[PDB]
Amino acid sequence: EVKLEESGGGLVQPGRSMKLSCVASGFIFSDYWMNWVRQSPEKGLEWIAQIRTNPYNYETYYSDSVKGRFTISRDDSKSSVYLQMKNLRSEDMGIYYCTWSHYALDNWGQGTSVTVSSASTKGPSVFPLAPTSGGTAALGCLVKDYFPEPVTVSWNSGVHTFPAVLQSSGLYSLSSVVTVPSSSLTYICNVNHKPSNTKVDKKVE
């Protein structure tokens, strides 16, 4: 089985550096070209770097978006490929995947998340969403002005937790809602934000 495992992702400030690593098994590493591809909502999939093999003198190829700031390298003694990223910008945010090439980009790792922001870690402000439509009653919690992702919301059956939106401020916001048949209506939302060491239980009347 082909196995690709990326690591090294995380949170960094604009202008700073970060090195990603990939470790591969299941093909003769030294015989195949390796690539990094990233994914963001705004740009979709973007191939960013390739490194070839001994017969190509380990030549490197880059998208214009990263040439000269990013460096791809490989260690054939460790079946490892690296991406050294310099002068990171908010536009570099996304999921970074390691790939090998035989037919195309034949297998991809799970990916490593890179987040680029000058925002300080901040725990959410949690506000109740308090009151029927097609028999249903809805209540929820607004989880406002936190950084970074993620939050987890739990309730003490019709739960929707919306994708976070990044605000002008650089802080995220989302709502988590409970839909119950009105006749089946003390609701408490438990909001966990690991990065800020914050846990809020909020009563919704």
Binding site: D64, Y97, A104, L105, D106
Partner: protein, 218 residues
């Protein structure tokens, strides 16, 4: 660089029907080796992309014969026969004839299901939030299909523009519906300028629009 144009962004299909995705390149993809390095990827929800078809028409290991690729030069098509739930995801076209290697914007293959009207709710800002100097007003649309819905905010007898943000869930794995939040964010000052807050929803499943409102301070 070579721009890959795929259509549509979102493609509804009924289970067991045929789906067809189109991709165009801005440059011929015939390589000097005489091969056409045009490929398709599938990305299922929460997963990495997987190679589906390479060199126009060759199914990758484990890809069933329901998937059929065709085309030449700059114009390509993927045909998926007898669509199954395992086929739903985002399909990407790609070229690797020319460096830089490039991708289309993706086509979400979505389950086409019967129309479902949203259940709609409005939530005033909490007394706690207003003590912080901001007012978040939330409109909630639950369990609708298709994804298109018009959410219009109304303050008193009139309309709002450019101060709201929508967030939409992924198509639900069990009921194949969407849910949506629309959040109107105002300073406390701007919130206290008006008495009546309303969100009006227009959707295929509603014979007429549904309005949910509150009076500030009720």
């Amino acid at each position: 660089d070579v721009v890959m144009t795929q259509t549509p962004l979102s493609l509804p299909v009924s289970l067991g029907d045929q789906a067809s995705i189109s991709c165009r390149s801005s440059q011929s993809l015939v390589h000097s080796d005489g091969n056409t390095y045009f490929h398709w990827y599938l990305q299922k929800p929460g997963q990495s992309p997987k190679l589906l078809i390479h060199r126009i028409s060759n199914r990758f290991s484990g890809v069933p014969d329901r998937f059929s690729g065709s085309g030449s030069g700059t114009d390509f098509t993927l045909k998926i026969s007898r669509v199954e739930a395992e086929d739903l995801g985002v399909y990407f076209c790609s070229q690797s004839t020319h460096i830089p290697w490039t991708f289309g914007g993706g086509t979400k293959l979505e389950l086409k299901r019967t129309v479902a009207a949203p259940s709609v709710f409005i939530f005033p800002p909490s007394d706690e939030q207003l003590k912080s100097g901001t007012a978040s007003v939330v409109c909630l649309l639950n369990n609708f299909y298709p994804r298109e819905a018009k959410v219009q905010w109304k303050v008193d007898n009139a309309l709002q523009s450019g101060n709201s943000q929508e967030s939409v869930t992924e198509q639900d794995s069990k009921d194949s519906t969407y849910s949506l939040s629309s959040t109107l964010t105002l300073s406390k000052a701007d919130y206290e300028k008006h008495k009546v807050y309303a969100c009006e929803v227009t959707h295929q499943g509603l014979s007429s629009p549904v309005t949910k409102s509150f009076n500030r301070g009720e």
